[PDB]
C-alpha cells in the first residue's frame, strides 16, 4: 500500500518531465559552426610517481597541483618548472583521492581508511605534518574536496556524505539519501550546492546549508564513476560504465545531451569541462581520452599519450592546459 | 642563467627526487598481498599466527619477515557488501590470498562464485590467486561422522574419482582425501578455464594449527616473481 504511492508519484514525475520536453539540445544547435579538429600536444611530462596514480586536483593559482599515488606519498607538482615542491608521507598507502584548498594552505587525502586527512602546507615549522584527521565514516572515502577554510565535504562508500567543520572536526551536516556507494561529487561555483553520483545509476543534488536532496537525475544504465559541474552553474555531465555520458540540467530537470559511440565499449573514469564548457574531456579505459562537443556531441580530439587506464583528468581554472594521470605513474600536461 | 629562487627550487626538487629514490627502493624491496575471505572462513587465526587506532578502520596491515624478505599483508576491515569498486585499487598487488572454509558445504557454491568473479575480473586477470582451504580437521570430522552427504550439494562428487597423482597423508581416511581432492578440482576448473598462461592458481591445504604457511607464501611469491620476470623479458 506504500510502494503504489511511490510508483505512481514516479510515473507522474516522469510524465511531467516528458511534457516539458519541447526540443532537444542537438536540434537547437544543429545550425551552428562546429569546433573542428581540436588537436592538443603534450607540453610537460611529470615523472617521479612510483605506484599507479588515482586522482589529481589543480590549484586556484594555476601553478601548483596535487596528485595521489598509491605508494604512500603526495607530491606537489609545478605546471611551469615541473619541479617537486613538497613531499607528504601518508600513513595509509591505499589512496584514492586528493584535494587542494582554495587558499593553498591545506591538502586533503583519503582512501580505504575511513579518514579524509587534512595536511597543512604553510605552518611555522616549515615541513609538513598531520594537521587534522576526520574519522567517523564506515566506508572508504571516494573523494573529499574543500569549500572554504572552515568546512569540508567528504563522500564515503557507505552511501552517505558528510560536511565536516575544520575547527571542530565533528559531523556538522549529514546526507543519507544515496542508496549506493558514493563514487564522485562536484561542487557548484557559488559554494552552495553540489551534485553527487553513486553506484545507483543516478545523481543527486544537495545543499550545504539545507542538508536535503532537492533534485534527483536518472537515466544511466550502470554505476556513475565521475561527475563535473558546468561553468555556468546550471548543468553537469555524468559518465558511467555503459560507455555513455549524460548531461543533466538543474534548472530543466531533464537530460540534455548523450555522448556515445559504437566503437566505445569501455567505461568513463574522469570528466571535466574547460573554462567555457564547450569541450568536455572524458577519459576511457581504451588508453585514450575523447573530447566531445557540448553542443554538437561530436568527437573533437583523441588523446593517446597514456599506455594504461586513464584515472584522473583535470582542467585548470583558466583552461590553459589539461593534466591527465593514468596507472602508468605519469602526469601529462596537454595544451 | 637562472634566478635566485630557481636555484633553491632545483635544489629542493633534487632532494625530493633523492628521497623518492630510497622510497622506491623500499617499495620494491617489500611485497604486498591482498587477503580475502568470508566471515565463516576464519582468517583471524591465519592473521594471528604471523610473527615478525580508530575502531572504524576499513583496512588492516600486518607486516612480517620471512627469509629476510618483508611481506605486508592487507586485510579488509569495515567495508560494505559491495566490493566491485575499491577492488580496482588492488591492481598492482603481488598475489591474492583467498581463504575458503571447507567444513561448510552450504557456502562452497558461494566460494566458487567469488573465486570465478575474482579470476574473471578485467583488472584481476594478471594477478595470481593463492587458495587456502582452511578447517581441514573439521572437514575430516564431518566426513567421518556421516550425518550429511556431499552429493546432495554437488552431483559431480558422485562421479568423481581419486586421481593417480594424489598424495594421501599418513593416517588419513580415503574418503576425506577424495572429498578434498574433489574440492580442489572444482576450484581449479575455474582457474584452468580462463588461465591462458597469463596467471595461475596456487592450491594449498591449511589446517587449524599450522606453522608452515609462511614458507608456502614465500615460495608462492618467489614463483610469481620468477613468472613475471620471465614474462617481462620475453623469454616466456
Amino acid at each position, epitope marked *: 500500500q506504500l510502494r503504489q504511492e511511490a510508483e505512481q508519484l514516479k510515473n507522474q514525475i516522469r510524465d511531467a518531465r516528458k511534457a516539458c520536453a519541447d526540443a532537444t539540445l542537438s536540434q537547437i544547435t544543429n545550425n551552428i559552426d562546429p569546433v573542428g579538429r581540436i588537436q592538443m600536444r603534450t607540453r610537460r611530462t611529470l615523472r617521479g610517481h612510483l605506484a599507479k596514480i588515482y586522482a589529481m586536483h589543480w590549484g586556484t593559482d594555476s601553478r601548483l597541483l596535487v596528485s595521489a599515488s598509491q605508494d604512500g606519498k603526495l607530491i606537489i607538482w609545478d605546471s611551469y618548472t615541473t619541479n617537486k615542491v613538497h613531499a607528504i608521507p601518508l600513513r595509509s598507502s591505499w589512496v584514492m583521492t586528493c584535494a587542494y584548498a582554495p587558499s593553498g594552505n591545506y591538502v586533503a587525502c583519503g582512501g580505504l581508511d575511513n579518514i579524509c586527512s587534512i595536511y597543512n602546507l604553510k605552518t611555522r615549522e616549515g615541513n609538513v605534518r598531520v594537521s587534522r584527521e576526520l574519522a567517523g565514516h564506515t566506508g572508504y572515502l571516494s573523494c573529499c574536496r574543500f569549500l572554504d577554510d572552515n568546512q569540508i565535504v567528504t563522500s564515503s562508500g557507505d552511501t552517505t556524505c558528510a560536511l565536516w567543520d575544520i575547527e571542530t572536526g565533528q559531523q556538522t551536516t549529514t546526507f543519507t539519501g544515496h542508496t549506493g556507494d558514493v563514487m564522485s561529487l562536484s561542487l557548484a561555483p557559488d559554494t552552495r550546492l553540489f551534485v553527487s553520483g553513486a553506484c545507483d545509476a543516478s545523481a543527486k543534488l544537495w545543499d550545504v546549508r539545507e542538508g536535503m536532496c532537492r533534485q534527483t537525475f536518472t537515466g544511466h544504465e550502470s554505476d556513475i564513476n565521475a561527475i563535473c559541474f558546468f561553468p555556468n552553474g546550471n548543468a553537469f555531465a555524468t559518465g558511467s560504465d555503459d560507455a555513455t555520458c549524460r548531461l543533466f540540467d538543474l534548472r530543466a530537470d531533464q537530460e540534455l545531451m548523450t555522448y556515445s559511440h559504437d566503437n566505445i565499449i569501455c567505461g568513463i573514469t574522469s570528466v571535466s569541462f574547460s573554462k567555457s564548457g564547450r569541450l568536455l574531456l572524458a577519459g576511457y579505459d581504451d588508453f585514450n581520452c575523447n573530447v566531445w562537443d557540448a553542443l554538437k556531441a561530436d568527437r573533437a580530439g583523441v588523446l593517446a599519450g597514456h599506455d594504461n587506464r586513464v584515472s584522473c583528468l583535470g582542467v585548470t581554472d583558466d583552461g590553459m592546459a589539461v593534466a591527465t594521470g593514468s596507472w602508468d605513474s605519469f602526469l601529462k600536461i596537454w595544451n | 642563467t637562472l634566478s635566485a629562487e630557481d636555484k633553491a627550487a632545483v635544489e629542493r626538487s633534487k632532494m625530493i627526487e633523492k628521497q623518492l629514490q630510497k622510497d622506491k627502493q623500499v617499495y620494491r624491496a617489500t611485497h604486498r598481498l591482498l587477503l580475502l575471505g568470508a566471515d565463516n572462513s576464519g582468517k583471524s587465526t591465519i592473521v594471528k599466527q604471523m610473527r615478525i587506532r580508530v575502531k572504524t578502520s576499513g583496512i588492516f596491515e600486518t607486516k612480517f619477515q620471512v627469509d629476510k624478505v618483508n611481506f605486508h599483508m592487507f586485510d579488509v576491515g569495515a567495508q560494505r557488501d559491495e566490493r566491485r569498486k575499491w577492488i580496482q585499487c588492488f591492481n598492482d598487488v603481488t598475489a591474492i590470498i583467498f581463504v575458503v572454509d571447507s567444513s561448510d558445504y552450504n557456502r562452497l557454491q558461494e566460494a566458487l562464485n567469488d573465486f*570465478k568473479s575474482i579470476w574473471n575480473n578485467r583488472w584481476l586477470r594478471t594477478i595470481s590467486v593463492i587458495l587456502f582451504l582452511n578447517k581441514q580437521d573439521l572437514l575430516a570430522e564431518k566426513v567421518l561422522a556421516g550425518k550429511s552427504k556431499i552429493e546432495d550439494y554437488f552431483p559431480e562428487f558422485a562421479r568423481y574419482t581419486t586421481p593417480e597423482d594424489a598424495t594421501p597423508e599418513p593416517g588419513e581416511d580415503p574418503r576425506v582425501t577424495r572429498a578434498k581432492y574433489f574440492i580442489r578440482d572444482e576450484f581449479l576448473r575455474i582457474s584452468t578455464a580462463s588461465g591462458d598462461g597469463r596467471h595461475y592458481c596456487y592450491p594449498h591445504f591449511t589446517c587449524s594449527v599450522d606453522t608452515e604457511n609462511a614458507r608456502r607464501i614465500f615460495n608462492d611469491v618467489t614463483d610469481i616473481i620468477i613468472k613475471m620476470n620471465l614474462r617481462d623479458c620475453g623469454l616466456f
Partner: nanobody
Amino acid sequence: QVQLQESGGGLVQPGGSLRLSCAASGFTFSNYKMNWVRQAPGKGLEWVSDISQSGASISYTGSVKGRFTISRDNAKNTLYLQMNSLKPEDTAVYYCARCPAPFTRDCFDVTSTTYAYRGQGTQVT
C-alpha cells in the same frame, strides 16, 4: 531508469512446474549478464543460475542442477525460467540480478544485500 519486474510465482504443491518471467526496462537487455538467485527464510542469498549476454554461457548450482532451465528473449527483452520437479525446500523469494559493467565477465555484488540493479523477487512455495 533501471527497472526489473518479476512475475509468475505463487503457491504450488511439491512436484509441479512454474514459469517465472522477468521483464527489464531502462537498459539494453542483450548487452548485460543476468543471474537468478534465491533467498530463504532464515538464510542468506544463494546463487541459483547465471546466463551471459548471448545465452551461450549458462551455469547452474549443484543443488538444483538439471531441473531449472533459464532462457532469454531479445525480441521482447524477457528472461524466462522454467522450474520442474519442485522440492518442498524450494519455498523462497527469487531475485534477478544484472551485471554492473557491460561486456564484462565479472560476477561481483550478485549476492549482496543492498543492490540497486535487482527486482523485488517473487515468492515460490
